[PDB]
Amino acid sequence: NGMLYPQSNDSRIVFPLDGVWDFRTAGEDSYPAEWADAPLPEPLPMAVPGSYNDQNDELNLRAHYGWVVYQRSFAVPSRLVAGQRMILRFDAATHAADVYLNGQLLGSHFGGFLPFEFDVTSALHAGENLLTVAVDNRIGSSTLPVGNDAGTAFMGSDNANVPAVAEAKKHARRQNLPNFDFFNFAGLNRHVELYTTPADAYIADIAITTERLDHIAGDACTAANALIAYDVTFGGDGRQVRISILDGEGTVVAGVTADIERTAKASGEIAIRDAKLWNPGAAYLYTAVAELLPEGGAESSSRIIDAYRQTFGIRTVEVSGTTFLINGKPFYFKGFGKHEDSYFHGRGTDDVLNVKDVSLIHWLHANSFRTSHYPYAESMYDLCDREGIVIIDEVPAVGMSWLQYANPLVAERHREAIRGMIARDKNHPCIVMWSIANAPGLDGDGERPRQAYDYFRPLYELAHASDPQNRPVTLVCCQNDYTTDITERTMDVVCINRYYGWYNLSGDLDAACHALNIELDFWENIGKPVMFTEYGADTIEGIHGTHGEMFSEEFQRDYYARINAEIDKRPWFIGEQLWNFADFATFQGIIRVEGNRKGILTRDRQPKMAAHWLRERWAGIPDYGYK
């Protein structure tokens, strides 16, 4: 179950396989088997990592439906593979992939936003190796994220009662129809790499938890004592593992040698005196170095069999009444939902962009975001660990309704996504909360609200069982009839998406604020902490008015000014994450002006009027103690 990010050290090496690959589009329902067994005929170039859709303007790959096939060759010195365990890792292949090496299927995966890997020790050979990866972009009623098997995309226009329209639909070209509001970018969206570990015995997983903090300082920078726990899992086959705790300067401040017991694990606790805590706006990271010792322990030899360096931060998270406590201090979220989205790359990971976006989060005086609507690339979490930005980590369970709740295949994929996200991400101190879905159907009459609850409650429990830190769990709720939804109010933090004054009461900020206050009165009675995870207004940079109407920069600024003045009056409202950080691509349609334009930044990360207004507001709101 461990998926530690590949590391290079004295016992391990990583060989990236990124670069310009060969590529062919394939069929709507299948691809040629022979393409895995020999070089692709007449290949196109395709950079990896990246979405494929915007990498070829001769083709219309945004319209592609079905399979594509990637391929490349590689060779490595025999000297480096000898005696080692060889693993091929795919950080993400969106949505489903079949991976072949030298004409043999290594295996398959479903789930477009989480990593998977194969043991290729026996499949590799000397000299050039031929790696082929078939990737399927199709979405439908059984995928996460969810597609529509017929009709229109989410937020699509129709005239379904016109006989000519009904007839033309029957014969129209097959297309993915997202039941979600972001473009279905597909392909090898994240890195590919070959890596090595020792074969006889190796470190397979590490979990670090902050179990307890004693006498936390007034400023939350330190605690008199921190109790941390480690759990190390091994693969392979009186053995021991040395655990060293390094502080921010790399000095060993704690260390223990633990017995490995059988499935093989070592676990224990370590007390850290005068512990330096991790906080939003004030990151501090330690490293847990795990070193597998040879048979005979340190008593017999100085050599190290295997090693892995796991970053971690010491901090607690606790929901208490209507507060969200980090290191016992009442936190207030400032930020937004994001997307992994950019020109050229699509959903492809881009660390230049991640580094820039983290600086923009600081420029705005924001302190947090949500990984709307899928787990992000691993590097972004490491960056937010070092930069003191809090994350709500969310699985790709977007577009769901009652059709999905009855389907065992969907429930299995949903559990896989929750387990996989938490297994990948559990050691990040920046992650303070898990989201098990975005905007599923929860309300209505008859049995529908109960059916939704019965689907989601076990997933809430799974997210708690899976996280060794036991962080809060939420479900991000779409604008709905909050009085018949019986699921959202059971979450640990209530996370609501609301578009009062945009999708309803349009343009009327007085009415919008009145409606918002009626719903806030409902949440006030429930007595849980509540935050916005979405609210906003599509905004075309450069459209201006003295009395700003919808789509103007002024309306977007006025929107936030009015709504935020209302939530400031509620002590139990513990965060404001708006929609969205930046404009992003969507399926085309009559309400999407070259995608979603609710960004406070443009797609090129330039600030609209509302961004300047929010920057000034957020400059004056502290991370702790605002409420």
Added chain:
Amino acid sequence: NGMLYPQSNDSRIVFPLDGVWDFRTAGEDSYPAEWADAPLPEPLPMAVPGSYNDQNDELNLRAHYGWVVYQRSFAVPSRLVAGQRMILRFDAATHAADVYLNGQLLGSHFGGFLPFEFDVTSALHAGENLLTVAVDNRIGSSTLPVGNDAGTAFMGSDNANVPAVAEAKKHARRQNLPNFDFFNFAGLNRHVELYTTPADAYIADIAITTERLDHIAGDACTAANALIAYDVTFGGRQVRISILDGEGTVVAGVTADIERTAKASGEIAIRDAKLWNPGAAYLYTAVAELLPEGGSSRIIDAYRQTFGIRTVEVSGTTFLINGKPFYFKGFGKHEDSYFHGRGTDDVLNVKDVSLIHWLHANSFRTSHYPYAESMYDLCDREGIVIIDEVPAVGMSWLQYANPLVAERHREAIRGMIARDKNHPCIVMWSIANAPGLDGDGERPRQAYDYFRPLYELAHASDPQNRPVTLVCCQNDYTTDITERTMDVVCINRYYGWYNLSGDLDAACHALNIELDFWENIGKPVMFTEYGADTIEGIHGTHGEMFSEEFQRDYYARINAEIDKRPWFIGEQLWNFADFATFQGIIRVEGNRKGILTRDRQPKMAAHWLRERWAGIPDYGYK
């Protein structure tokens, strides 16, 4: 010299001639005179008032050089012309016109921004009359505004040393090359109307002045006594002068003797007078009624002249309105809009005045030509102060020696002041924009010798004797010897835009060095231009030139510096709104230094300035 705006009353009627006229383009240096003798052949439609250039997308009338010909027919009842003096008034024909009625040349005019009229009493006849108006758009080294006879337009790019360029220039299509930074919009830009007066004796001109205020209230809303003067000129005995307040109540009145050349003049004391102020307009009406011999109750002629009671005085480094130290907040404007060009549009004037209030500004300058008369009436009623400017833009030493230019300059000054003298909203005259004033050898003295008589002329022409300025281009202020002699120093400066580009620290340092120079000069000083081209929608976290943020940052930094100077009495920025120019490599669909877009939408800087100006009082800021 009186040019009272036409009025309808019991003794006078106005017959508007606006509408869709017939139109033809003509030649570079000529037009067919015979077109005045018959309907124009194969005419195009052309709305009047309006520039013609943007009224026909099949043609490229922005490229037109030379003459066009307008024409229409009209008829009026014989009973109404009978016994009357009939006057045909052109509010503006840009730049020069030959006017014919029924094939008879009435005369011509040069000067594209001031009204002119003809007595058509004898040329009119019963039934349909045919009015033909040839309009010349050409500009050059002897016109105001100034054109270039060769080379490029102002701030145009060139590669003059490339032989192919030099040769191609010799054979290129003739084009007006403005030596000014706005498009050369031409045609019947303002209204046309026929009007009547009595023929035997009539009112030709009226001047009302505020001579003295006694015991002005602390809030300047009133004075214990105001002494006003009237001067009424007649064409073609007694005149009754009645002073009506804001409710139409006659609060003062005198009957004055007419003496010959025929004029009546005197003074009237108004106790507890209600004063006109920026942000708090109050208007009276002086009604002049020509009485019959000798004498009966009946009225021979009448005219109703709006005015406001207020004084204007420069005192040391202060600009006093009703004895209170005023601070200018505002901008240069243009008469410029999509479709209309330089054409007057009162929907746009009403909207723009509301935007001036929305911004919390209190003033503007008529850059760079007198505006339509209706805009001044609007600013009279809306309490917005005006600096009134003649079209003497683009001038340099080439012009100062040209007698035709000098005569046209004197004509514009006399004509502007004769037309506009009664507006209380006008507090200062500008005799030029951005002429060449600095340099070495004899050049600075040559400029002074040209402009000083025009300064004196503006003072001699205005019965209110308001301050006179000359709006100065960014220049070597140490060798300019003319600007510092004006009543108010009005400077155009672009530190950080056209120089020290993008570096606001350096721009502010340079500005402060020049402010130190003006501090020593000891006159009141204001900005009349400063700004940055800005494309709405271009944004940056660290705003660079052309972004909305840079424009906002520009004003935030520069205004913080002038706030430190007690003698700096106003900030008029460039510009109220984006406007059209001749095309070139520094004009992105015109001049983009507007704080509003050309469609009057607010850029980031407009919101910032609105908040700043909201906190600055009209009186007492310094």
